[PDB]
Amino acid sequence: HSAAEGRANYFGNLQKGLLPHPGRLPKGQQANSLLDLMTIRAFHSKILRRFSLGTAVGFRIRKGDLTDIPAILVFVARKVHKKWLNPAQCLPAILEGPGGVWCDVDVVEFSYYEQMFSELVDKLSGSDESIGSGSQVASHETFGTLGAIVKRRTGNKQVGFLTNHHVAVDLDYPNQKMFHPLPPNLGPGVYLGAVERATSFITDDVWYGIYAGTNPETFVRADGAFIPFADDFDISTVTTVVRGVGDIGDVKVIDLQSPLNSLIGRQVSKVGRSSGHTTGTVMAYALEYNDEKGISFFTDILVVGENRQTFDLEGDSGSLIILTSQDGEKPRPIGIIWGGRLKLTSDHGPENWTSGVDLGRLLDRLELDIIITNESLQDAVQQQRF
Amino acid sequence: HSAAEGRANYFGNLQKGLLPHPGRLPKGQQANSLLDLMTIRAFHSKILRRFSLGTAVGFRIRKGDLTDIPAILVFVARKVHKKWLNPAQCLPAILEGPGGVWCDVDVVEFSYYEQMFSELVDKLSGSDESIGSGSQVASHETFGTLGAIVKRRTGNKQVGFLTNHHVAVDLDYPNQKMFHPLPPNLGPGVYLGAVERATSFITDDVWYGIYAGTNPETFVRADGAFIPFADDFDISTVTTVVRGVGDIGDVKVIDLQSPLNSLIGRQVSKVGRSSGHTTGTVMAYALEYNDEKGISFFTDILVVGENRQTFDLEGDSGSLIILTSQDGEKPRPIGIIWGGRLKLTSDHGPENWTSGVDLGRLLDRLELDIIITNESLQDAVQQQRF
Amino acid sequence: HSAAEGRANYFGNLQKGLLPRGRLPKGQQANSLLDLMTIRAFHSKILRRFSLGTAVGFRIRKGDLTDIPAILVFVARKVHKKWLNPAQCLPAILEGPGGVWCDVDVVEFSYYGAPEQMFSELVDKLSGSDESIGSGSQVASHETFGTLGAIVKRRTGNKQVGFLTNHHVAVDLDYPNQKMFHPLPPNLGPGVYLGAVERATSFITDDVWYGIYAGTNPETFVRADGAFIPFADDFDISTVTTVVRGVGDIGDVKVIDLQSPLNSLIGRQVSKVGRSSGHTTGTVMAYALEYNDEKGISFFTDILVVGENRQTFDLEGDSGSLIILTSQDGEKPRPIGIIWGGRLKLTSDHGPENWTSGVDLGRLLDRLELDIIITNESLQDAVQQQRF
Amino acid sequence: HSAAEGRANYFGNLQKGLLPRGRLPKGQQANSLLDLMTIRAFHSKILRRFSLGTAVGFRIRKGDLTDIPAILVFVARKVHKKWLNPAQCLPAILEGPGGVWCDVDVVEFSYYGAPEQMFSELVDKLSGSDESIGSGSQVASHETFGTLGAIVKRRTGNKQVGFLTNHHVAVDLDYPNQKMFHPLPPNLGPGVYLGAVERATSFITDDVWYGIYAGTNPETFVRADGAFIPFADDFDISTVTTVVRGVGDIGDVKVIDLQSPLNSLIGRQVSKVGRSSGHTTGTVMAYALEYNDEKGISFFTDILVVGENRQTFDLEGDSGSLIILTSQDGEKPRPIGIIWGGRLKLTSDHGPENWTSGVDLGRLLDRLELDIIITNESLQDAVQQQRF
Numbered sequence A, B: 001h002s003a004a005e006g007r008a009n010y011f012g013n014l015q016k017g018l019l020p021h022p023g024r025l026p027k028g029q030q031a032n033s034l035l036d037l038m039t040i041r042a043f044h045s046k047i048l049r050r051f052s053l054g055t056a057v058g059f060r061i062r063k064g065d066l067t068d069i070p071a072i073l074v075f076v077a078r079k080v081h082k083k084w085l086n087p088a089q090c091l092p093a094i095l096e097g098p099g100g101v102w103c104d105v106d107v108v109e110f111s112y113y114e115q116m117f118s119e120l121v122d123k124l125s126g127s128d129e130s131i132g133s134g135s136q137v138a139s140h141e142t143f144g145t146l147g148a149i150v151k152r153r154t155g156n157k158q159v160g161f162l163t164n165h166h167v168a169v170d171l172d173y174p175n176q177k178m179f180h181p182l183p184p185n186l187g188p189g190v191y192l193g194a195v196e197r198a199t200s201f202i203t204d205d206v207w208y209g210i211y212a213g214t215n216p217e218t219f220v221r222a223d224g225a226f227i228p229f230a231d232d233f234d235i236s237t238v239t240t241v242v243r244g245v246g247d248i249g250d251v252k253v254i255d256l257q258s259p260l261n262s263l264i265g266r267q268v269s270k271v272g273r274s275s276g277h278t279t280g281t282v283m284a285y286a287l288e289y290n291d292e293k294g295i296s297f298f299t300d301i302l303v304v305g306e307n308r309q310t311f312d313l314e315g316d317s318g319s320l321i322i323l324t325s326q327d328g329e330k331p332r333p334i335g336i337i338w339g340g341r342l343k344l345t346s347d348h349g350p351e352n353w354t355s356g357v358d359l360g361r362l363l364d365r366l367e368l369d370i371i372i373t374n375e376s377l378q379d380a381v382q383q384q385r386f
Numbered sequence C, D: 001h002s003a004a005e006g007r008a009n010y011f012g013n014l015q016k017g018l019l020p021r022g023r024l025p026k027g028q029q030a031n032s033l034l035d036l037m038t039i040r041a042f043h044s045k046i047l048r049r050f051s052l053g054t055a056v057g058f059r060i061r062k063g064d065l066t067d068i069p070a071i072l073v074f075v076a077r078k079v080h081k082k083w084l085n086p087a088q089c090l091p092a093i094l095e096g097p098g099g100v101w102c103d104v105d106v107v108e109f110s111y112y113g114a115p116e117q118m119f120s121e122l123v124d125k126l127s128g129s130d131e132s133i134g135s136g137s138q139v140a141s142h143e144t145f146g147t148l149g150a151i152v153k154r155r156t157g158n159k160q161v162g163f164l165t166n167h168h169v170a171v172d173l174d175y176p177n178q179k180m181f182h183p184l185p186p187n188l189g190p191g192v193y194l195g196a197v198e199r200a201t202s203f204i205t206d207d208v209w210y211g212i213y214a215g216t217n218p219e220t221f222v223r224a225d226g227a228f229i230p231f232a233d234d235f236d237i238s239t240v241t242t243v244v245r246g247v248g249d250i251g252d253v254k255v256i257d258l259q260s261p262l263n264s265l266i267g268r269q270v271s272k273v274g275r276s277s278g279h280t281t282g283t284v285m286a287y288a289l290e291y292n293d294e295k296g297i298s299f300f301t302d303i304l305v306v307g308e309n310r311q312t313f314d315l316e317g318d319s320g321s322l323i324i325l326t327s328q329d330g331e332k333p334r335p336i337g338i339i340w341g342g343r344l345k346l347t348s349d350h351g352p353e354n355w356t357s358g359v360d361l362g363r364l365l366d367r368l369e370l371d372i373i374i375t376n377e378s379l380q381d382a383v384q385q386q387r388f
């Protein structure tokens, strides 16, 4: 009947099919997928969530370096030696899931707690003759980054752009009008259009396809806004190139059944109005944060910048998170930056961390397709007039 | 085609059917309706909006007292003698509309810029055994007032309550759950339900049925939230009585073609969690405020408290604005308080002013009906189970 | 061995001998402060949950003090039973360990208090326009202003004569010697040197103060603000008066016995004379108030006073003031406490009233080994005995 | 009659004799500051709209100074033409009243400036560790700290010897006599009394200062900060040095003639020595900068300087410092201004640089009737002439 009663039933039967190892290697299959790790974390949510700030899935971190061992990352405010912790507080090293699928449990010091100057940043902020990924999109109050030139799959098949919802939508005013570079009250700019569809919170069952936690009120922070280009807008100013990266391919969907090496540990790049071109590493997926109001919130992609340099700054929200080319293939996008420190090494200090929204799932919810070539763009314009 | 092009056409033809009095009494018909005053104000919006903070329609105010002369109230920050004003600044005394309908122009000093203790306030805040109009409804952050026990007209015909949207809906979190008296993080309370439909901004053409201004971006601040009662909620705790007023009748719709005496100048009463029972006078309708972002905003009902006492305080939002009985008839509701001073007399200081939303139009937009007797309530419960 | 192990033993014994009970024997009804404190101590856990604090006294119904012995439970918002969870709703009666039973009253209440200016002849006199120093006089260190509570003499030792005030005003341990002046310190204005603090109390454990375990917390401390300032050698005792201005000549300290009828303290009219509000009257509403912080420590305050006719009993700066019972049969009024270094809602018609906190004078005088001087002859005699 | 009616006449005449023009005669290109200022004055309205301010100088292209005479127009955000309204986009060339034409350059620019500490031997010396007082020395009133600009002598009257600094630092008209000390005022630290301000300039009208109508505003004023502090009678002149520490011996003031080639000022390297940043170098980027407030008044600043190698030319406290041209052919370096009591974006690669404001020294010296002393012999001679 109710979604809560359905979720309680699913976890009820997982407990009902259960049985209880003297230091022997786990007999069950080791996790090799994101779904495997997420299922184990869901079953053991309560005592993972206790004495913890959040949880995520990925590979174990040892001495600041990413291993190849699938793991549930448990985030703590202060990581101390086991000798100073109570036996209840010390988290396990291995967790056994419902169907025998097992994984490791890593502990990472973590907290949920500037404008860079380059030729690119100048171009993205209004000096370039073209609008594209990275361009500063602004409403009358907030500044953000254009993520992708998109077209609607159904209906009018309208051509527009995708960015983060918080930057585009402020539901304290009637229309949400977007301009580049600045809105009329703050500076020069051209009217791009208004937000027509937006997503803020999606339930985990619809987003991931599985129950990612025990909380009846569990929502994914799926920030996303589609702005159809205005009728008077000139599409010849639009480019499908990601400046600083080049021509990109189509969205790479995050399949929960694929090997973790396909996402976790992969190098990613982003181009935004505030920090320009940065590179980073995907460190975790499906981060869980529990507020004081009883709601469990999920963020898809967790990225840490490379070489102890921040991956994003305030204003890079909406930027496209693009996988780097491994085999000469065109780099493919996997996420957008959502609207934050972790301590990896003892020698150095805390590094910054950023959040991303799964692009494939966001594009599905908003029923949007990414335009990756100029030929496709002009074709999509013609299809819109149709 | 576009709504702006339709609005521009309507005002274009009104200008096209035009012609130009030596102090002779206006030959046209004097306004006798809200629509008449609103049409004249719409035609002359520009130079009424210039050298002004806002405009509204009602009766002229002379020496602090309400006259019987239909008028367009022009609100100014400082009212000075004509000798100290430039000829362009001095507003006219009479304005002639498109079809010869004429009205007067009144000038009122105005600005858009506490908990009372009584037995009633205590009952409304959680000491009474019943929930009804006036009861403190609270989300996890904002406190407000329950306006009316309502039932949906169509669909499931669900029974719930009406309050102001801003108090119930905060679109920074997934669900908007309402409790009485307090939410779980701040104190004891019972779960009432969650918001299922809400209205924030309606265009003037849909709300009023006419173009109330020349601005292409013109919206009515029609704050409203319907919260269907939870399945587990006990309806025997619900009362249809307005404590401090008694049994009330059905909504009195504000017809724009009725004589102005039916609304302007009428005594109204409200019962809220913060100020309790207060009385006031309806002073104006369809107040226009122009922001710095180019959007024209409209508020329906303007109320000033009687005897220089405030009509509302922060927290009375959602309260039902009820007309007082003139002929022994049950008092009938006309509005809800929306989520502020005017100088009427020289002897005393500035009085406070409050805003109301047209209940008939809000009930139509949300497709809701007010329940005014316990028999009707239990009948509506049975119809919901149906 | 440890006090915690002794306290844990005491409550473990009470649980072991407990025989649970419907309607319960009348005549086993509490008639003492100790009776109410023992019941509250046993049921500390279930009372401390969903509550800001507890105290013992008389049940309050419709804002008026009844004669029914009760444990007052203080809540941030008092709501109707229908909006409460069954676990949240408090009992109306609680049976103690030995079958002694009492009532459980609920009061809306807040701790939002750290401690304005009232203008009268007394306030002016207390602040430095009187030719005499006594109870109510402004005592000032270099930073904080307070009120002189009582002219006192030490029981043992040199038997020195000085005055009593609150310790948080007198002692600021960030510097070595705490010097008091009247009216003002030399950095802010004119004044004479009264002396320096020689002994002070801040926290006493409940087993020492009350003589019983008032709670289950291994860390339970009574906020017993108290400071003795022996008068300086050069100080002129002829400037000192033992009269409480606004009340007159006072009797000796009235000790608060826990076995006496609650009538003797709860509900009694009290008066105070302080530098900030002058003469005010109030009513003792509760005894032994428990507050649980976020750091796990339980704190106790002795006397709770609410001003009469919806007027505040004290203001910031009145700390140190003597809380004095009113005369009932013409007897000289007798002091029972000092104001410690705060709102409750009693009536639905009116708004929240302020509450103030008092320290048990008899127990503070015992810990500090001080005696109150109530007549000028006793003063001069004590000055001579100090020289002896 | 009125200055406004005279100014309105001047521009009414220029419009009446104006013969509008495609490509326009080269050789009628501006070659002077006056030429650029006259074109900007005529076109003030269309330039002041959509702009934060204007100045005259050389066009800037790709962050480098060109040799093309231009009116620099300062904008909060410089965007590509495609995101601009046709009315918003500025011209590339503007023809003046008499056919004299110039270019129109756009620069990102902000007025976010009211005026840190740099550590060096010079700064220490200027702040009170040197045995001599001169240009760069910290001059202090009881509230504000500044920089001694130049040792000066009055041309007429008693011909008294004193020093020149900025008036906002020297004069605070909320009290009668403005006393200067070095290094510090008596309320804050040690120091010797230098003297009190006897004459000061704050606002001069543009017709008096420049000799022309620099704008169409009836209310147009040049921010001409300047204060003369005659040395006290008791002051010891042997402590005064005419050397600019960090530069050496300087020549006499180089006047800024509006009819001279822009090469003579725009783009020239300048140096300054102040109490806060010490010795810094910069480049003169523009002259006669116009700022329009919200109260309807147009204000003008003479010299605009940007520091070299992306380092700030000045800091708060450097006001009063002498802006000194660098030597080109071994000649003694000559002063051209003083720093008035501020960011621009030149390059896309790097970030916003700071800009500072200077007052025309030759015109400030004229209004205040002062002459600069550039050698110790001239100093002592002037001391004797004052006694005469």
Ligand SMILES: Nc1ncnc2c1ncn2[C@@H]1O[C@H](COP(=O)(O)OP(=O)(O)OP(=O)(O)O)[C@@H](O)[C@H]1O
Binding pocket: A051, A060, A061, A062, A063, A064, A076, A078, A079, A080, A081, A082, A083, A085, A089, A090, A091, A105, A106, A107, A108
């Ligand atoms: N609740 C907790 N809060 C803080 N620290 C904890 C907690 N539980 C365990 N720890 C600490 O975390 C350690 C485990 O760290 P982790 O699982 O990351 O180890 P690792 O990957 O083998 O090595 P490395 O420490 O290099 O990452 C425990 O030994 C203990 O010191």
Ligand SMILES: Nc1ncnc2c1ncn2[C@@H]1O[C@H](COP(=O)(O)OP(=O)(O)OP(=O)(O)O)[C@@H](O)[C@H]1O
Binding pocket: B051, B060, B061, B062, B063, B064, B076, B078, B079, B080, B081, B082, B083, B085, B089, B090, B091, B105, B106, B107, B108
């Ligand atoms: N733009 C304006 N700003 C301020 N004051 C104005 C403006 N235009 C007109 N007024 C003032 O308002 C006056 C008109 O006031 P109004 O129309 O309310 O008069 P009334 O109703 O006859 O009398 P009363 O002043 O008693 O209300 C003018 O005479 C003038 O002094």
Ligand SMILES: Nc1ncnc2c1ncn2[C@@H]1O[C@H](COP(=O)(O)OP(=O)(O)OP(=O)(O)O)[C@@H](O)[C@H]1O
Binding pocket: B188, C050, C059, C060, C061, C062, C063, C075, C077, C078, C079, C080, C081, C084, C088, C089, C090, C104, C105, C106, C107
């Ligand atoms: N945990 C709680 N938090 C808030 N309110 C509570 C709580 N438990 C009980 N109450 C409220 O307090 C009421 C009991 O109040 P109380 O003990 O003061 O009664 P009383 O002395 O008979 O009457 P009066 O309300 O007139 O003082 C309950 O009926 C309920 O409405």
Ligand SMILES: Nc1ncnc2c1ncn2[C@@H]1O[C@H](COP(=O)(O)OP(=O)(O)OP(=O)(O)O)[C@@H](O)[C@H]1O
Binding pocket: A188, D050, D059, D060, D061, D062, D063, D075, D077, D078, D079, D080, D081, D084, D088, D089, D090, D104, D105, D106, D107
């Ligand atoms: N009102 C305005 N606000 C902001 N930017 C403007 C405005 N008017 C013009 N611009 C921008 O300034 C440009 C002209 O800049 P400018 O005069 O400095 O050119 P330049 O000297 O040839 O080159 P550079 O940009 O390298 O300095 C226009 O093409 C347009 O992009």
